[PDB]
Design a protein around this ligand. Structure first.
Ligand SMILES: CCCCCCCCOCCOCCOCCOCCO
Ligand SMILES: CCCCCCCCOCCOCCOCCOCCO
Ligand SMILES: CCCCCCCCOCCOCCOCCOCCO
Ligand SMILES: CCCCCCCCOCCOCCOCCOCCO
Length: 701
């Protein structure tokens, strides 16, 4: 069946009005079958299958959740759930996810603000026709246990209801007395009017976590005695967090009402209303914060924290369908959107027994260990936290947007398709800051309005082939993180009046369905760039004079090579350049970065590739193998802090016990490679999980 294919022909996003073969834009789909084969449980893990998507890390001024970079540009503020932005900081789960669609290239005409290098859209499982009950019970090394249940009941009168439930725990693999994850979720929905002209779907999503959060490995260069170079040479799986102090609790609720009416057999009006509540409460450890203790065999437990509470309402109204004038065939989506988000943000003060207060920590010089503020670089041991944390409010933030767009793919003849999109956005961000020890209370506000677009031509040499050229723009206003997120987007007194950043993608490509439509190959060559980047000029002045660009190549191959052999593979070459830099400022002092003009962009590898392939060795036995490769990744503009290249292997075996029951073994990071998945701009990098195994009993009725 098609549900079992690694090749996905159509996007579930109704803003992609044409099949992916004929769409003049790069789109990768992390398919249902790939998700099942790999047993990825988080978006972050899932993204490892897409080469060149690099993950970013948190620090003092930005949260430590999902931070995907696409073609060199952060998509943290451009993460979508069924086409609606939901970009509060979260570690997103896969339990209610059908597939993940990664748009690569500038895409504001489809998504509004952001989408500079691309965007991610997670497609949810929802109630549908046909009865079924599916489940998984699994156990794995390092105290992994996971149970999921997914039941769908078709009442046979156009009504169906579905619920997925999740219970999950694991320790980070290979990291003893280290990070720990626990979470529970539920996702019930009900749909009405199946197979009729008038339809309604009510859905709810809930996920709640209770974790001991990861730390990282500090950068160190022994020759220089400085916090730079590669991560310190310490034992694999070393944890520098402070388990008695550190924690992270996330809680997310999403409620959606979607109403559809078919005005004709070819034109549908849809209204989607989404209500989201998102909380994040955390304390985690930066290993040494570049204080130099590493060179004396010690690590200071620098504290990073935040407490956020966000509520968002979004409504999208879209008219979709097709109209054939006789000469031209239009495939369209025209619409309007409104959203409003409000966020409260605070963090933690640390108070010692004498009443001293800090937001960062005590004894950063490791002069006194009696309250356990530093640990051993080699063989750290977990100790009590004996100071006190106290919640402290910092600011609130309100983002309101309104937009209208037209998307139309015009078939001129069966060989010629003209793709068009045009969108107008109005954006307002307002942030009210409480007084601090160094500044009075103030309000920052940005108002931006901007038009973005896309234009492409697709030529089809045959019905199974496409060759295209396209151009698309993006705009990214200050304050886009809506209070807490990517720190490059944070609004303040001095940038609040600045116009949006401007980006664009020029792409040429080709796509082909082969082997009786069992295989799809894609190739693209592009320049994705931010030709107007916001940069700092001095400690209290900004301007839009920066520039960067990524010249790249992407190749993708998905589907069935034979009726026993399938494949999902990708390659990318990314030649990135920080063409024109501003200054780096800290505590009133700015360092000029023009000396780094021409450097490689951080958080992007020059090359990367992934491969997943499976073979039906017996009719009841499938075996899978994967490889993930990345070149080295820089953390900083100066290109002095980095993590090395790596290859990571995976394997799988699935045995069909009977028609309803499978046993599936996954071995992850099969060679137990020590590598790093995130490189922060300073201080540290995040180690990838070590080797693990998971064994599951999967059922399907
Ligand atoms: C200020 C924007 C919020 C408007 C009301 C909807 C908030 C949704 O709350 C949680 C939904 O679940
Ligand atoms: C479907 C949206 C229709 C496009 C609205 C155009 C209104 C222009 O708004 C001004 C926004 O800021 C300046 C943008 O530059 C003006 C370019 O005008 C393009 C006309 O299509
Ligand atoms: C049966 C029609 C012939 C199709 C020939 C297509 C040639 C391939 O073009 C490659 C584009 O690059
Ligand atoms: C600008 C007109 C767009 C026509 C459709 C796009 C065809 C690609 O034209 C741009 C150059 O493409 C070079 C790649 O093709 C090489 C052989 O295939």
């Amino acid at each position: 069946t098609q549900e079992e294919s690694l090749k996905v022909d159509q996007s579930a996003n109704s803003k992609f009005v044409a099949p992916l073969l004929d769409t003049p834009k790069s789109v990768s789909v992390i398919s249902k079958q790939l998700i099942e084969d790999t047993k990825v449980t988080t978006l972050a893990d899932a993204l490892r299958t897409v080469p060149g998507i690099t993950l970013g890390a948190g620090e003092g001024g930005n949260p430590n959740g999902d931070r995907p970079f696409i073609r060199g540009y952060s998509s943290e503020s451009s993460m979508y759930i069924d086409g609606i932005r939901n970009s509060t900081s979260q570690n997103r789960e896969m339990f209610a996810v059908e597939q993940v669609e990664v748009t690569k290239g500038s895409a504001s005409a489809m998504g509004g603000a952001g989408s500079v290098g691309g965007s991610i859209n997670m497609i949810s499982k929802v109630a549908k026709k046909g009865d079924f009950l599916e489940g998984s019970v699994a156990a794995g090394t390092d105290n992994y246990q996971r149970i999921t249940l997914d039941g769908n009941k078709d009442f046979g009168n156009g009504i169906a209801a579905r619920v997925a439930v999740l219970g999950h725990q694991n320790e980070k693999a290979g990291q003893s007395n280290g990070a720990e994850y626990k979470r529970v979720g539920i996702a019930p929905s009900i749909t009405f009017g199946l197979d009729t002209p008038t339809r309604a779907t009510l859905s709810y999503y809930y996920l709640q976590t209770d974790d001991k959060p990861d730390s990282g490995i500090p950068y160190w260069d022994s020759s220089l005695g400085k916090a730079q170079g590669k991560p310190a040479e310490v034992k694999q799986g070393t944890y520098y967090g402070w388990k008695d102090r550190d924690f992270q609790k996330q809680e997310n609720h999403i409620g959606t009402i979607k109403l559809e009416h078919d005005l004709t057999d070819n034109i549908t009006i849809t209204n989607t209303a989404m209500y989201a509540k998102s909380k994040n409460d955390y304390v985690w450890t930066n290993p040494d914060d570049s204080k130099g203790n590493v060179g004396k065999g010690l690590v200071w437990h620098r504290l990073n924290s935040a407490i956020t509470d966000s509520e968002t309402f979004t409504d999208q109204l879209a008219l979709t369908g097709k109209f054939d004038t006789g000469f031209l065939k239009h495939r369209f989506n025209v619409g309007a959107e409104y959203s409003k988000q409000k966020t409260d943000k605070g963090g933690y003060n640390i108070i010692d027994a004498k009443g001293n207060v800090s937001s960062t920590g005590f004894y950063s010089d490791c002069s006194d260990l009696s309250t356990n503020w530093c640990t051993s670089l080699n063989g750290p041991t977990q100790k009590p936290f004996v100071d006190r944390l106290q919640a402290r409010p910092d600011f609130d933030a309100t983002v309101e947007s309104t937009s209208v767009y037209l998307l139309d793919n015009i078939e001129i003849t069966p060989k010629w398709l003209l793709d068009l999109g045009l969108r107008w956005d109005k954006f307002e961000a307002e942030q009210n800051f409480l007084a601090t020890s160094s500044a009075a209370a103030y309000t920052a506000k940005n108002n931006s309005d901007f038009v973005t677009y896309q234009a492409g031509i697709t030529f089809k040499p045959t019905e199974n082939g496409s060759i295209y050229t396209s151009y698309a723009t993006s705009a990214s206003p200050v304050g886009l993180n809506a209070g807490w997120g990517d720190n490059s987007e944070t609004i303040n007194a001095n940038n609040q009046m600045i116009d949006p950043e401007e980006a664009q993608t020029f792409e040429i490509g080709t796509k082909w369905d082969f082997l009786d439509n069992h295989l799809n190959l894609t190739a693209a060559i592009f320049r994705t760039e931010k030709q107007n980047t916001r940069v700092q000029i001095d400690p209290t002045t900004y301007a839009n004079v920066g520039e960067s660009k990524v010249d790249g190549f992407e190749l993708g191959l998905n589907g069935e090579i034979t009726d026993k052999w399938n494949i999902s593979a990708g390659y990318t070459y990314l030649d990135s350049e920080l063409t024109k830099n501003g200054k780096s400022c800290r505590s009133g002092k700015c360092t000029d970065q023009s000396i780094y003009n021409g450097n490689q962009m951080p958080n992007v590898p020059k090359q990367a590739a992934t491969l997943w392939t499976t073979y039906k060795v017996l009719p009841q036995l499938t075996v899978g193998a994967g490889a993930v490769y990345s070149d080295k990744v820089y953390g900083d503009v100066a290109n002095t802090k980095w993590v090395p290249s790596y290859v990571r292997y995976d394997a799988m075996a699935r045995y069909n016990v009977n028609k309803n029951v499978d046993l599936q073994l996954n071995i992850n990071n099969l060679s137990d490679k020590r590598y790093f998945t995130k490189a922060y701009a300073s201080h540290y990098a995040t180690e990838a999980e070590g080797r693990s195994a998971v064994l599951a009993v999967n059922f399907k009725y």
